[PDB]
């Protein structure tokens, strides 16, 4: 109407500026030394390729839906928009997979081959925007629009176009994001269960050497034995090495527990200090792997990727819903004029919120990421 041109214009300026900055910094200072940087670079490049043709739609909506740029530019702009959707989707799925691999299983050739394959697949999935998209002079008037053409045989094509967006743009990719981020959460849970339980075991180990009576030592060993049993369950995602590490450990708490029961504080504290030797020989190699996995969540790249993935799917939720309502209407499942008018009057609004993430992805670097050196240098 009147805000779509303005929203499109602000998206264009902010996104092109931010994505140029992101490409510059990633390629110059980050130097593509990480797989996540290659996928983020490709995401920024896809956003730039989308924003290049964005001014055409801003003026096209501004001049009351009139297209003076020709059939070739109509095809190219539609293909660029669909390509942006599909390429961003695939790059986010690969970013989530890479984050899962980095978190749970601590490769540039495969990364670049995957980027090329993603670009080719996104270009192929935008083929309907190239084939069935031509300028259309409305009746005998001079008004020209960039319309989506069909045929008699392709009567189910509008179903195919709408369902392809839901499935290949939201449904299947969101499963992989959920699958990867659930396995990340499972690994972070067992990395924190082992770390939190050992802190309880380590906090009370300072109490034993500090206390000077049998009652305080026995009460401290009681909470050390329960933490040692809990930690033995938090097996990191070779099995006997972890289990036998705590079978020895709980066996030394018992020896210290049956020395504090006799009121022998000197031997209860001496046997408690023997848990240092068991920790280093068997358990210390797993507290580092638990700490290394636990502090990767603190990495700013993890925040950036999670913020980009979270906002992209949330911004596309309203559009995929109304796309799914539209295909039901085409199927005739929903037959009501009241519902149809709501879908038609909300499609342009949701199509603008869906592509608003092109100008917010660069801003997630400044907010989530703390490494905005070149953002202040430049």
């Amino acid at each position: 109407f009147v805000m779509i041109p303005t929203l499109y214009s602000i998206i264009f300026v902010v996104g092109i500026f931010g994505n140029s900055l992101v490409v510059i910094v990633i390629y110059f200072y980050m130097k593509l030394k990480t797989v996540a940087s290659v996928f983020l670079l490709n995401l920024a490049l896809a956003d730039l390729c989308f924003l290049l043709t964005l001014p055409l739609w801003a003026v096209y909506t501004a001049m009351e839906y009139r297209w003076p740029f020709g059939n070739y530019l109509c095809k190219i702009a539609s293909a660029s928009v669909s390509f942006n959707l599909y390429a961003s989707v695939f790059l986010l799925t690969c970013l989530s997979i890479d984050r899962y691999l980095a978190i749970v299983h601590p490769t540039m050739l495969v990364a670049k081959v995957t980027c090329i394959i993603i670009w080719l697949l996104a270009g192929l999935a935008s083929l309907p925007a190239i084939i069935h998209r031509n300028v259309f002079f409305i009746e005998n008037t001079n008004i020209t629009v960039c319309a989506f053409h069909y045929e008699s045989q392709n009567s189910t094509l509008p179903i195919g176009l709408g369902l392809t967006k839901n499935i290949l743009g939201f449904l299947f990719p969101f499963l992989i994001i959920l699958t990867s981020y659930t396995l990340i959460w499972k690994a972070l849970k067992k990395a924190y269960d082992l770390e939190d339980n050992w802190e309880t075991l380590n906090d009370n180990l300072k109490v034993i050497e500090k206390a000077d009576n049998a009652a305080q030592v026995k009460d401290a060993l009681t909470k050390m034995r329960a933490a040692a049993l809990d930690a033995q369950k938090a097996t990191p995602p070779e099995m006997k090495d972890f289990r036998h590490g705590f079978d020895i450990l709980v066996g030394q708490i018992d020896d210290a527990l049956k020395l504090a029961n006799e009121g022998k504080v000197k031997e209860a504290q001496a046997a408690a200090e023997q848990l240092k030797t068991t920790r280093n020989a068997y358990i210390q190699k797993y507290l580092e792997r638990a700490r290394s996995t636990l502090d990767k969540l603190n990495d700013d790249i993890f925040k950036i990727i999670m913020a980009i993935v979270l906002f992209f799917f949330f911004s596309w939720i309203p559009h995929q819903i109304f796309t799914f309502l539209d295909v039901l209407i085409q199927l005739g499942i929903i037959r009501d004029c009241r519902i149809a008018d709501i879908v038609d009057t909300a499609m342009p609004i949701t199509i603008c919120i869906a592509y608003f993430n092109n100008c917010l992805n660069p801003l997630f670097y400044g907010f989530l990421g703390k490494k905005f050196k070149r953002y202040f240098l430049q």
Partner: nanobody
Framework: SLRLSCAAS????????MGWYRQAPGKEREFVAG???????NYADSVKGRFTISRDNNTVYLQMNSLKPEDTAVYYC????????????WGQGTQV
Amino acid sequence: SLRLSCAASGYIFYRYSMGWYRQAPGKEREFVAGISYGATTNYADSVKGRFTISRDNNTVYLQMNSLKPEDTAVYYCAAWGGRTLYFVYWGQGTQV
């Protein structure tokens, strides 16, 4: 005096204008007739008086009167509409 018919039901015929296009020997597929859901007829000025389109209750009929040799071609019945996103459906193409 011929009369062409085009049936389209469901998503079409209540939100998209329906009409006819002819593929002239010049190979341009020009506009012929068109009827909207508001029953507002609109014909090309070249055949404004000879033809008369008609909408029914989910088929559109085109009535022809003169049938000069200048209108001997294949007629595709289109279906165009969409307030924001524009869609066009094309017919099989009937030769006269």
